[PDB]
mmCIF file of C-alpha atoms and ligand atoms in Angstrom:
data_model
loop_
_atom_site.group_PDB
_atom_site.id
_atom_site.type_symbol
_atom_site.label_atom_id
_atom_site.label_comp_id
_atom_site.label_asym_id
_atom_site.label_seq_id
_atom_site.Cartn_x
_atom_site.Cartn_y
_atom_site.Cartn_z
ATOM 1 C CA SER X 1 0.000 0.000 0.000
ATOM 2 C CA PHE X 2 2.008 2.966 -1.316
ATOM 3 C CA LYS X 3 -0.927 5.370 -1.177
ATOM 4 C CA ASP X 4 -1.060 5.872 2.596
ATOM 5 C CA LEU X 5 2.607 6.941 2.842
ATOM 6 C CA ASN X 6 2.107 10.625 1.989
ATOM 7 C CA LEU X 7 4.136 10.453 -1.206
ATOM 8 C CA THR X 8 5.765 13.680 -2.327
ATOM 9 C CA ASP X 9 5.167 14.958 -5.836
ATOM 10 C CA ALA X 10 8.695 13.851 -6.774
ATOM 11 C CA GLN X 11 7.937 10.366 -5.459
ATOM 12 C CA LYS X 12 4.713 10.190 -7.474
ATOM 13 C CA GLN X 13 6.657 11.002 -10.654
ATOM 14 C CA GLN X 14 9.336 8.452 -9.665
ATOM 15 C CA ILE X 15 6.750 5.700 -9.180
ATOM 16 C CA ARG X 16 5.283 6.550 -12.570
ATOM 17 C CA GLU X 17 8.769 6.281 -14.061
ATOM 18 C CA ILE X 18 9.280 2.919 -12.336
ATOM 19 C CA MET X 19 5.934 1.445 -13.390
ATOM 20 C CA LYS X 20 6.878 2.330 -16.959
ATOM 21 C CA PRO X 29 -5.549 -13.991 -15.277
ATOM 22 C CA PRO X 30 -5.811 -16.332 -18.310
ATOM 23 C CA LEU X 31 -9.062 -18.157 -18.934
ATOM 24 C CA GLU X 32 -7.029 -21.158 -20.197
ATOM 25 C CA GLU X 33 -5.917 -21.815 -16.658
ATOM 26 C CA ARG X 34 -9.463 -21.600 -15.357
ATOM 27 C CA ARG X 35 -10.747 -24.034 -18.005
ATOM 28 C CA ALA X 36 -8.004 -26.503 -17.001
ATOM 29 C CA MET X 37 -8.969 -26.155 -13.350
ATOM 30 C CA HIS X 38 -12.611 -26.639 -14.332
ATOM 31 C CA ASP X 39 -11.816 -29.935 -16.105
ATOM 32 C CA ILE X 40 -10.123 -31.211 -12.955
ATOM 33 C CA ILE X 41 -12.815 -30.081 -10.618
ATOM 34 C CA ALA X 42 -15.951 -31.126 -12.539
ATOM 35 C CA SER X 43 -15.125 -34.826 -12.807
ATOM 36 C CA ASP X 44 -16.316 -37.856 -10.879
ATOM 37 C CA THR X 45 -12.756 -38.475 -9.553
ATOM 38 C CA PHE X 46 -9.873 -36.264 -8.474
ATOM 39 C CA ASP X 47 -6.917 -36.822 -10.780
ATOM 40 C CA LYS X 48 -3.916 -35.747 -8.703
ATOM 41 C CA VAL X 49 -1.449 -36.375 -11.532
ATOM 42 C CA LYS X 50 -3.425 -34.212 -13.923
ATOM 43 C CA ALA X 51 -3.814 -31.549 -11.183
ATOM 44 C CA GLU X 52 -0.090 -31.341 -10.504
ATOM 45 C CA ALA X 53 0.549 -30.946 -14.219
ATOM 46 C CA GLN X 54 -2.078 -28.186 -14.317
ATOM 47 C CA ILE X 55 -0.554 -26.357 -11.381
ATOM 48 C CA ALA X 56 2.941 -26.492 -12.873
ATOM 49 C CA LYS X 57 1.976 -25.342 -16.388
ATOM 50 C CA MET X 58 2.449 -21.554 -16.032
ATOM 51 C CA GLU X 59 5.499 -21.747 -13.724
ATOM 52 C CA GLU X 60 7.607 -19.645 -16.130
ATOM 53 C CA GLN X 61 4.983 -16.939 -16.566
ATOM 54 C CA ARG X 62 4.492 -16.783 -12.785
ATOM 55 C CA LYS X 63 8.243 -16.448 -12.301
ATOM 56 C CA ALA X 64 8.480 -13.556 -14.798
ATOM 57 C CA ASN X 65 5.512 -11.853 -13.197
ATOM 58 C CA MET X 66 6.681 -12.210 -9.625
ATOM 59 C CA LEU X 67 10.202 -11.077 -10.455
ATOM 60 C CA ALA X 68 8.784 -7.978 -12.096
ATOM 61 C CA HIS X 69 6.576 -7.356 -9.076
ATOM 62 C CA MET X 70 9.339 -7.825 -6.519
ATOM 63 C CA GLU X 71 11.773 -5.652 -8.463
ATOM 64 C CA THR X 72 9.225 -2.899 -8.837
ATOM 65 C CA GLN X 73 8.384 -3.013 -5.146
ATOM 66 C CA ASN X 74 12.082 -2.869 -4.268
ATOM 67 C CA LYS X 75 12.584 0.162 -6.513
ATOM 68 C CA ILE X 76 9.665 1.964 -4.883
ATOM 69 C CA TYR X 77 10.781 1.005 -1.397
ATOM 70 C CA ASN X 78 14.106 2.633 -2.107
ATOM 71 C CA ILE X 79 12.674 6.023 -3.067
ATOM 72 C CA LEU X 80 11.002 6.272 0.368
ATOM 73 C CA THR X 81 12.283 8.308 3.279
ATOM 74 C CA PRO X 82 13.309 6.480 6.435
ATOM 75 C CA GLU X 83 10.008 7.526 8.035
ATOM 76 C CA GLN X 84 8.048 6.160 5.069
ATOM 77 C CA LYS X 85 10.085 2.941 5.091
ATOM 78 C CA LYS X 86 9.204 2.278 8.716
ATOM 79 C CA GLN X 87 5.529 2.806 7.899
ATOM 80 C CA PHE X 88 5.704 0.579 4.848
ATOM 81 C CA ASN X 89 7.449 -2.174 6.868
ATOM 82 C CA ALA X 90 5.030 -1.854 9.759
ATOM 83 C CA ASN X 91 2.132 -2.213 7.285
ATOM 84 C CA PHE X 92 3.903 -5.154 5.720
ATOM 85 C CA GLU X 93 4.045 -6.891 9.145
ATOM 86 C CA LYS X 94 0.382 -6.273 10.008
ATOM 87 C CA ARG X 95 -0.878 -7.901 6.800
ATOM 88 C CA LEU X 96 -1.042 -11.435 5.390
ATOM 89 C CA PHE R 2 -22.962 -17.984 -5.489
ATOM 90 C CA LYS R 3 -23.906 -20.924 -3.254
ATOM 91 C CA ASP R 4 -27.403 -20.648 -4.738
ATOM 92 C CA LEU R 5 -27.320 -24.423 -4.999
ATOM 93 C CA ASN R 6 -30.008 -25.240 -2.408
ATOM 94 C CA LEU R 7 -27.779 -27.479 -0.365
ATOM 95 C CA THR R 8 -29.362 -30.498 1.376
ATOM 96 C CA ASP R 9 -28.626 -30.596 5.185
ATOM 97 C CA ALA R 10 -26.947 -33.937 4.411
ATOM 98 C CA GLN R 11 -25.014 -32.003 1.736
ATOM 99 C CA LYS R 12 -23.961 -29.114 4.006
ATOM 100 C CA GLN R 13 -23.107 -31.551 6.799
ATOM 101 C CA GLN R 14 -21.002 -33.318 4.167
ATOM 102 C CA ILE R 15 -19.366 -30.081 2.915
ATOM 103 C CA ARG R 16 -18.320 -28.946 6.358
ATOM 104 C CA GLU R 17 -16.855 -32.440 6.773
ATOM 105 C CA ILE R 18 -14.909 -32.069 3.515
ATOM 106 C CA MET R 19 -13.528 -28.722 4.616
ATOM 107 C CA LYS R 20 -12.703 -29.956 8.120
ATOM 108 C CA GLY R 21 -10.438 -32.555 6.512
ATOM 109 C CA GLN R 22 -9.224 -30.611 3.501
ATOM 110 C CA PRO R 30 3.338 -20.202 6.293
ATOM 111 C CA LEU R 31 5.374 -17.123 7.299
ATOM 112 C CA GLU R 32 8.822 -17.996 6.043
ATOM 113 C CA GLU R 33 7.953 -17.175 2.400
ATOM 114 C CA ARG R 34 6.465 -13.830 3.382
ATOM 115 C CA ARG R 35 9.439 -12.731 5.487
ATOM 116 C CA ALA R 36 11.832 -13.741 2.722
ATOM 117 C CA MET R 37 9.753 -11.682 0.268
ATOM 118 C CA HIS R 38 9.802 -8.809 2.693
ATOM 119 C CA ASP R 39 13.568 -8.986 3.010
ATOM 120 C CA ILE R 40 13.963 -8.934 -0.804
ATOM 121 C CA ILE R 41 11.751 -5.882 -1.129
ATOM 122 C CA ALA R 42 13.255 -3.966 1.850
ATOM 123 C CA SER R 43 16.836 -4.218 0.605
ATOM 124 C CA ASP R 44 19.177 -1.560 -0.776
ATOM 125 C CA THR R 45 19.508 -3.440 -4.089
ATOM 126 C CA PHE R 46 17.354 -5.987 -5.896
ATOM 127 C CA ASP R 47 18.927 -9.433 -5.831
ATOM 128 C CA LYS R 48 17.461 -11.375 -8.733
ATOM 129 C CA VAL R 49 18.991 -14.742 -7.902
ATOM 130 C CA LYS R 50 17.731 -14.471 -4.345
ATOM 131 C CA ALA R 51 14.314 -13.441 -5.630
ATOM 132 C CA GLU R 52 14.263 -16.429 -7.934
ATOM 133 C CA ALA R 53 14.951 -18.720 -4.984
ATOM 134 C CA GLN R 54 12.056 -17.159 -3.028
ATOM 135 C CA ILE R 55 9.757 -17.644 -5.985
ATOM 136 C CA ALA R 56 10.767 -21.310 -6.349
ATOM 137 C CA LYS R 57 10.155 -21.897 -2.655
ATOM 138 C CA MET R 58 6.723 -20.284 -2.931
ATOM 139 C CA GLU R 59 5.896 -22.764 -5.760
ATOM 140 C CA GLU R 60 5.995 -25.520 -3.056
ATOM 141 C CA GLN R 61 3.323 -23.895 -1.015
ATOM 142 C CA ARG R 62 1.257 -22.957 -4.026
ATOM 143 C CA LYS R 63 1.249 -26.572 -5.170
ATOM 144 C CA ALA R 64 0.116 -27.739 -1.733
ATOM 145 C CA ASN R 65 -2.555 -25.054 -1.556
ATOM 146 C CA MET R 66 -3.868 -25.581 -5.071
ATOM 147 C CA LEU R 67 -4.019 -29.361 -4.708
ATOM 148 C CA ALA R 68 -6.010 -29.060 -1.485
ATOM 149 C CA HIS R 69 -8.349 -26.472 -3.016
ATOM 150 C CA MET R 70 -9.055 -28.446 -6.184
ATOM 151 C CA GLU R 71 -9.478 -31.657 -4.235
ATOM 152 C CA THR R 72 -11.958 -29.962 -1.915
ATOM 153 C CA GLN R 73 -13.948 -28.427 -4.773
ATOM 154 C CA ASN R 74 -13.985 -31.773 -6.585
ATOM 155 C CA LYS R 75 -15.314 -33.466 -3.457
ATOM 156 C CA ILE R 76 -18.066 -30.863 -3.262
ATOM 157 C CA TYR R 77 -18.990 -31.080 -6.938
ATOM 158 C CA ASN R 78 -19.557 -34.811 -6.447
ATOM 159 C CA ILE R 79 -22.024 -34.464 -3.568
ATOM 160 C CA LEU R 80 -24.274 -32.422 -5.910
ATOM 161 C CA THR R 81 -27.399 -33.306 -7.926
ATOM 162 C CA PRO R 82 -27.288 -33.097 -11.741
ATOM 163 C CA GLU R 83 -29.225 -29.804 -11.667
ATOM 164 C CA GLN R 84 -26.903 -28.421 -8.945
ATOM 165 C CA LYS R 85 -23.765 -29.392 -10.954
ATOM 166 C CA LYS R 86 -25.092 -27.468 -13.960
ATOM 167 C CA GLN R 87 -25.447 -24.496 -11.653
ATOM 168 C CA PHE R 88 -22.080 -25.006 -10.033
ATOM 169 C CA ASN R 89 -20.559 -25.136 -13.521
ATOM 170 C CA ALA R 90 -22.304 -21.915 -14.548
ATOM 171 C CA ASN R 91 -21.126 -20.146 -11.387
ATOM 172 C CA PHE R 92 -17.646 -21.386 -12.083
ATOM 173 C CA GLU R 93 -17.560 -19.395 -15.326
ATOM 174 C CA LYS R 94 -18.222 -16.159 -13.413
ATOM 175 C CA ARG R 95 -15.641 -16.730 -10.667
ATOM 176 C CA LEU R 96 -11.913 -16.107 -10.697
ATOM 177 C CA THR R 97 -10.670 -18.441 -7.949
HETATM 178 CL CL1 CL W 1 -13.571 -22.105 -16.477
HETATM 179 CL CL1 CL W 2 6.852 -10.269 6.685
HETATM 180 ZN ZN1 ZN W 3 13.085 10.424 -12.027
HETATM 181 ZN ZN1 ZN W 4 -15.367 -23.387 -17.165
HETATM 182 ZN ZN1 ZN W 5 -13.488 -29.144 -20.384
HETATM 183 ZN ZN1 ZN W 6 -5.009 -38.861 -15.299
HETATM 184 ZN ZN1 ZN W 7 3.487 -34.813 -6.086
HETATM 185 ZN ZN1 ZN W 8 9.082 -26.752 -13.131
HETATM 186 ZN ZN1 ZN W 9 13.284 -18.909 -16.572
HETATM 187 ZN ZN1 ZN W 10 3.094 -5.798 -8.864
HETATM 188 ZN ZN1 ZN W 11 3.270 -7.555 -3.049
HETATM 189 ZN ZN1 ZN W 12 14.807 -4.663 -13.987
HETATM 190 ZN ZN1 ZN W 13 20.988 0.565 3.519
HETATM 191 ZN ZN1 ZN W 14 6.031 -31.226 -3.079
HETATM 192 ZN ZN1 ZN W 15 -9.943 -24.022 -0.860
HETATM 193 ZN ZN1 ZN W 16 -7.104 -36.790 -0.046
HETATM 194 ZN ZN1 ZN W 17 -11.783 -22.173 -6.276
#
């Protein structure tokens, strides 16, 4: 939550600079779920299918969040970390 | 939408299904984000570790939903399947 940190105008521009759900996966889950048996082998295959895309997405997310973290003041960092701890 | 008109035997059964069917990953993520530099190889390791938990969580979720689907009447399964198309998890 980067909104409730009282971002300065410079920080808002910096975040803009930094920042610049497939139905296939649902249909595969549906085929596993709507069946008269639970096929664990087929489910594990399903779960693993978009491993690479997940990796790319989560690396992008974590890098972006790290970049934004590092434009914060020490006061804002403490708030961001406190918020991080009180969520899950 | 649980607009499926669940039999008390069905609901009893569902609760039973659910009854049957952590922090480390989060703190590691936190420590990657709250770091002076982004460490890609470390982030990749965190992501790979999270794939373990995701597989456990997804298998339990699909198994649970499958068990539910199979306590349903033909008309309720049609409805369950229609609801499925509108949902995202
Ligand atoms: Cl679907
Ligand atoms: Cl944490
Ligand atoms: Zn700039
Ligand atoms: Zn579907
Ligand atoms: Zn199908
Ligand atoms: Zn199979
Ligand atoms: Zn396995
Ligand atoms: Zn793999
Ligand atoms: Zn790769
Ligand atoms: Zn993101
Ligand atoms: Zn996040
Ligand atoms: Zn980058
Ligand atoms: Zn430092
Ligand atoms: Zn495993
Ligand atoms: Zn679940
Ligand atoms: Zn089981
Ligand atoms: Zn679901």
